[PDB]
Amino acid sequence: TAEAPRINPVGIQYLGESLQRQVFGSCGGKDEVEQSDKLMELSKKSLKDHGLWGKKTLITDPISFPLPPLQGRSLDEHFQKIGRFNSEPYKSFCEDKFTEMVARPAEWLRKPGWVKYVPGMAPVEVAYPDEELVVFDVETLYNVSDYPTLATALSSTAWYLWCSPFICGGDDPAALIPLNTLNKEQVVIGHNVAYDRARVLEEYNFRDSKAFFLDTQSLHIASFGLCSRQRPMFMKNNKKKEAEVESEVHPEISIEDYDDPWLNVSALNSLKDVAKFHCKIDLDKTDRDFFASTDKSTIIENFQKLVNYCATDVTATSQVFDKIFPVFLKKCPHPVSFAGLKSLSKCILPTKLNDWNDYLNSSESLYQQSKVQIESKIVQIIKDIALLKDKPDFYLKDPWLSQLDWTTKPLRLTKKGVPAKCQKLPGFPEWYRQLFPSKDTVEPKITIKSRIIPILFKLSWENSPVIWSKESGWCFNVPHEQVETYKAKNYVLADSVSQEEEEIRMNNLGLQCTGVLFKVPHPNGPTFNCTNLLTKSYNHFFEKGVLKSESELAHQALQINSSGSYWMSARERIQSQFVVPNCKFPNEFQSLSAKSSLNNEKTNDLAIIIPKIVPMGTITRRAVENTWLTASNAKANRIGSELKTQVKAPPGYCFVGADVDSEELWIASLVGDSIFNVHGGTAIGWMCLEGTKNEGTDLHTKTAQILGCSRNEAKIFNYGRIYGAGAKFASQLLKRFNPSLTDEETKKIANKLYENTKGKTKRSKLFKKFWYGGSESILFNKLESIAEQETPKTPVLGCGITYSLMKKNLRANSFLPSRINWAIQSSGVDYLHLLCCSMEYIIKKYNLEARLCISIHDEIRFLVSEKDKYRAAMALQISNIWTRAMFCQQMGINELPQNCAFFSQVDIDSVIRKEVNMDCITPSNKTAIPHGEALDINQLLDKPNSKLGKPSLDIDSKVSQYAYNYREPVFEEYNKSYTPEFLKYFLAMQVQSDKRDVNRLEDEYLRECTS
DNA sequence: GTCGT
DNA sequence: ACGACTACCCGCGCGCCGCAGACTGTCT
DNA sequence: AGACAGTCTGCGGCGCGCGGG
């Protein structure tokens, strides 16, 4: 009756026969049986050492449902043909591009709209250029409005100029540039092209577009990338440039280029630096000042020079692209990369105008009131203190007040006249005078972040006033008889120089001296000093009675800081967004579906925001957004944290979204398990694959119960260990999570956890230094082994590394921890590209009404009508299983576990939030939001409308034309170098747990080598 | 790239 | 001089130091 | 009636801590 589960030697489930046939086809192995016997004995020893042999795992019923068929005999052929289908039209336009440039017109004309100039003929007026490929540039005035002012375009046969009606006679500055994007397929090349895309008229539609905007900055960051090592390497480049500019003679190859050949590899991302590095062109940026004016009559003059400057920028961009493009084509030869690059450039954000304005007003109105209410009282306190000038004894017999500078400057007297020498507050103490910046200032300036805040307040650490020392920071005084006693609680003595400084400071006031000075502890360590006392770290110490105040203002200050830090950080970015309403452009906001189907209300308000996304702005080739990839989540106390809830779907539509579970951990486990050619060969892989999230048995949750912390903190703890964190930092993090623990406990727990995870180290001559005896030793050794290759490539697709981080350019400096993370963090991007390609292929094939809305890292959302929601979820599941199967096949394994095949949850909602069940209550927002829906695979299958429907026959016919070429995987050519006996003896030494075993196996290997 | 034995 | 080291992004506020710039007071 | 040498008086760039994903 029921199908029997299929289980490999270790207790893990695989896919059913139906899914096996529909995904992997007919594949057989058993070629390496003789090697697999010895490998299985070694794996048996490794698993029995850690007590994981014969342990129970989760087993469920098989899952069977019909998938769409594949287009090849292997996954690689299928993905290549789909990528060629999806990137065929525009890539032919990218090649055969013109290399010669036509001449410029002698004189330009000021007419509203689009004017075409062809050399040898009279200029004409056109509605739109109607060209396959153009180079584009836009200029706007940013102090009057956000709308464009003029535009220039170049093609292979003519020049095009666009002029706004605002500068040709008129008072309405709202206008947009038309390009007929909804009907004509075209490629537009530019530098930071998203800013230019935001000013196009036909981009403000819910219906999809047919234009491809390409950026040269991403192409420069990918190949010939800037170092971007998050290192002083950026400072190193700047100081080299300063030194080279300073000295006419440049013997660079003599000293600094010999030690650091990386210096002459790349430059900065700006257009000036990129153009200067790639070509011998010098550009001028002065003319930008002409666009900083408020009046428009200045733009009427100097028309010719501004237009010529725009044309020069266009020419420079054209030459830069012509130089860069083939190198990027050589570095990334797979079509899926280009398809994903095209796909990641069409984001859109629906909003509403009035709600946006109300949200902004509420946030600002709360923030300013909260700031002013606490800033009012400190001035009164200062004015109360300031009347003690006449009597010295009060402030000379007080502990806190005696650390101020009370010296007064005498009144100057020029001969026979008033001084009038720009004096500031004559006959006043120095600390009072220092508050006022200028003569015009009448009210003192003070914030809660000023240095003298503890002195103005009365702050005590264990009933001892705080003292400021220039060398060490904040300190407190301990009597002699207890100096040893306070050393029992891990209090570090201050530096000696501070001791003499305190000695003379007291001696100037007499009072002899008692005790020594200890330092207030700092969370990062004993070496770092303390300079602030109202941060998050000292909030805990305000409770439990360690830090105490004689005034009621400190706790309020802590509340206000914690409530307003994020809004203070992000207010300028948030308030400057460009929002376009429906009232101004009544012929553009067209529905995604072809049929209108009414759904019209009494003048409803809608708006669209186009994000400024740079597709490839990282060495690991991730995307960059300054505002929308850094948005905070909703919190009860935090002000203005409901930003992402402002994205609302129009009536009759919804959002469908998904997020990937434990991506890089799974990738690392697969890389570790690839050696034994079995799932669960290593201990870490068996621990990772034995549980799943829906029953609360995943690795992060288990670490959370072992360490007694949250899952988010456990993620940081687990990733830090993998990416190279020491045991001391781990103990510091453990104390950070639980601040009521002693240092000794954290040290023993950290050492015990690190000993089990990583074994001892063995150093030899013929074999280099390696770890042994640990559960993850093989994974680590494989990480440095692949990091030390001559030509590193991503294991799945085969993308090369940037020239800055290559071995030959790095002579002395190494940057190893940045070289190790690169492969995993780039596979994380290959995953997203494959997902996007699969989803958009399915959307084209089955005629679904959907469009990509937003793509945060490892999280994707789509805007879908009411009818086709479950079909979109189904397509998401199919894309996920195809991507995982491709990753498994590229490593040399033709099997897939059942537990990790599908998404845990799929979210259907009307707004963007982390969880569908959140209420999103903030101090700014007093209204709850209704909950959404979340579904897993079985409940999705139970739905009646989950089925796809009938396909289109012509799509497969078009796809079948493209060609396929066989390529060898990268790990095979890596393995070609090493001899088999070397690998077997090395792994046999790695699986041992004792030094004598390693020595005797090394001796046997040496004897075999001699024999 | 940067800092201790 | 060798070995050990969480990784990739974004940005605001406060203290410090190097220079323009105005005010006299002899000095011519 | 200038010449110029001190003599203060701010103003701007830099860097590093401190927070968000």
Ligand SMILES: Nc1ncnc2c1ncn2[C@H]1C[C@H](O)[C@@H](COP(=O)(O)OP(=O)(O)OP(=O)(O)O)O1
């Ligand atoms: N401190 C960190 N250090 C290094 N990498 C991190 C760190 N935090 C997050 N990441 C990495 C790992 C992830 O691939 C990715 C973050 O995506 P994320 O979804 O939050 O983690 P996750 O997918 O493993 O958990 P979950 O299953 O809950 O989604 O970047």
Ligand SMILES: *P(=O)(O)OC[C@@H]1CC[C@H](n2cc(C)c(=O)[nH]c2=O)O1
């Ligand atoms: P936020 O919702 O917290 O994070 C979403 C994405 C996932 C990946 C990226 N990211 C976040 C954090 C906190 C990190 O340390 N590293 C990341 O890459 O932000």
Ligand SMILES: [Mg+2]
């Ligand atoms: Mg995730």
